[PDB]
Design a protein around this ligand. Structure first.
Ligand code: CL
Length: 544
């Protein structure tokens, strides 16, 4: 009950599901240390500024993800809607990951781990024990492929959903619905098991990562950046996506959190601490993952680049292999699975609660008694239906598609650039300065102004231009080539969320009555000073 423990408990859970799952696979795909530089560049130039901006928006507007924009600038309020849609797409695969962990939980209660040996039913005759095996013939990899997912030849015929994954996803969705319906009262102490538990586990891995034989090669590879991959543009796209995924920005959840936060909240310290802790956690996770990969390369003899899958699910391949080497593998495996499940459940709770809060703030009584609860189910079950498409036999391809196009890609970058352009240019930097000064009692420095006005919008524009101009066909584990129609489907899924901005703009422009300048300025000016509209904003707000 000390001051330090209190100020630590005040700060929410810095650990995230993307830090333990998405960041390792992204770092392994991007080459290791070559990915660290763009990640740090985006965290310093764009991550923390956008995080602070969204926290300030939430704390000042005291509204959801959409109503805040209506209060700030109705013309671009459609942006908020798009964000909500993205959230849904996120869940479409996010909760699915939890089901996987759930299955591993039921596999963690045996004396002998299933991924330890090859002498099993689901393992193919090509399975070779570590005591060598190829990328697709390792015991843990064979287990993860042909016992949890049960991959298909391709996305042309996904087949029927697996009953095990279906039951796991159903149970997890029931837990998620009951946590909101009955309510969770153990939050005040849940940090004691959600905040301290992951980091310590990483320590148990880190001390083990340096202890694993043959891990020096993976560590030396991780500490060697490659300039040829830096010249390539996909690393920058992956870094910009991972920054937004880790900081949870561009999803409107941080806006709802700031709205729920008190008015006299010093957001600068929170933003700085969260950024530093996320950077440190990502560095430690990458170090441990590459140590594990070096150990696996030494044990199997294959090249470090060809050790495991260069795609989603790298955690379920890397962590059990390291736990098997640890003494008493059952205990550490159960601890890691419980920690991962709790982190993912907390992230899903936050995202779903933010989305429901935004949709209930936009449409009234769509939050009156039972009306607030039933709608929740109307979301969850529907998502569960989409979750079915991900729990199919060849559902990993649809999972990769939704991860690359639906909830990531050009969509998040476009939405973030538009938010920054509306706040800095349309709304005004001086207005935001005065708002922050009235809120927290201090005026931010010129660095935040230059980042919100020039650095972040131009950086996002360049990133999205590099993404659109130079595009590579999506592949799965560098072995399966997605069909031509799959690329079009992914682009259509991305454009469905991207086009939400101009459509609402045109709708509001046609909705407002009056001259053209009046029609535009009634949507540009906030709803609060809606007495008479200055048809031409002077050069003073724009240049300054
Ligand atoms: Cl990250």
């Amino acid at each position: 009950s000390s001051k330090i423990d209190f100020v630590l408990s005040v700060a929410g859970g810095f650990v995230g599901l993307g830090n333990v799952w998405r960041f390792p696979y992204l770092c392994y795909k991007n080459g290791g240390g070559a990915f660290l530089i763009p990640y740090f560049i985006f965290l310093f130039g764009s991550g923390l500024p956008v995080f602070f901006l969204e926290i300030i928006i939430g704390q000042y507007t005291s509204e959801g993800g959409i109503t805040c924009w209506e209060k700030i600038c109705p013309l671009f309020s459609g942006i908020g809607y798009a964000s909500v849609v993205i959230v849904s797409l996120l869940n479409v695969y996010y909760i699915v990951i939890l089901a996987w962990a759930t299955y591993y939980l039921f596999q963690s209660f045996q004396k002998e781990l299933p991924w330890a040996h090859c002498n099993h039913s689901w393992n193919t005759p090509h399975c070779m024990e570590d005591t060598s095996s190829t990328n697709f013939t390792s015991p843990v990899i064979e287990f993860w492929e042909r016992n949890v997912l049960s991959l298909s030849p391709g996305i042309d015929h996904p087949g029927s959903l697996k009953w095990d994954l279906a039951l796991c996803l159903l149970l997890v969705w029931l837990v998620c619905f009951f946590c909101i319906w009955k309510g969770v009262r153990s939050t005040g102490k849940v940090v004691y098991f959600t905040a301290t538990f992951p980091f310590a586990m990483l320590l148990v891995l880190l001390v083990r990562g340096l202890t694993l034989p043959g891990a020096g090669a993976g560590i030396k590879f991780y500490l060697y950046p490659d300039i040829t991959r830096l010249e390539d543009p996909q690393v920058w796209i992956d870094a910009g996506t991972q920054i937004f995924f880790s900081y949870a920005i561009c999803l409107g959840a941080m806006t709802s959190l700031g709205s729920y936060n008190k008015y006299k909240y010093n957001s600068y310290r929170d933003c700085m601490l969260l950024g530093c802790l996320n950077s440190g956690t990502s560095f430690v996770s990458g170090f441990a993952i590459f140590s594990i990969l070096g150990f696996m390369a030494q044990e199997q003899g294959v090249d470090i680049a060809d050790v495991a899958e260069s795609g989603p699910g790298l955690a379920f391949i890397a962590y059990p292999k390291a736990v098997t080497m640890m003494p008493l593998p059952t205990f550490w495996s159960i601890l890691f699975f419980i920690m991962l499940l709790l982190l993912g459940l907390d992230s899903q709770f936050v995202e779903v609660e933010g989305q429901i809060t935004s949709l209930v703030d936009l449409y009234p009584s769509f939050r009156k008694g039972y009306r607030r609860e039933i709608f929740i189910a109307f979301v969850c079950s529907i998502s569960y239906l989409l979750g079915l498409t991900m729990v199919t036999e060849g559902g990993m391809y649809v999972f990769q598609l939704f991860d690359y196009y639906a909830a990531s890609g050009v969509c998040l970058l476009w939405v973030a650039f538009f938010e920054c352009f509306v706040i800095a240019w349309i709304y005004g930097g001086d207005n935001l300065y005065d708002g922050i000064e009235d809120m927290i009692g201090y005026r931010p420095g010129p660095w935040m102004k230059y980042s919100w006005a020039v650095i972040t919008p131009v950086l996002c524009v360049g990133c999205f231009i590099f993404s659109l101009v130079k595009y590579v066909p999506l592949t799965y584990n560098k072995t399966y080539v997605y069909p031509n129609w799959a690329i079009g489907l992914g682009w259509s899924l991305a454009l469905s969320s991207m086009l939400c901005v101009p459509l609402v703009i045109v709708i509001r422009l046609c909705q407002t009555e009056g001259p053209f300048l009046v029609r535009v300025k009634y949507l540009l000016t906030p709803r609060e000073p809606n007495r008479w509209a200055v048809e031409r904003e002077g050069a003073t707000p724009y240049n300054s």
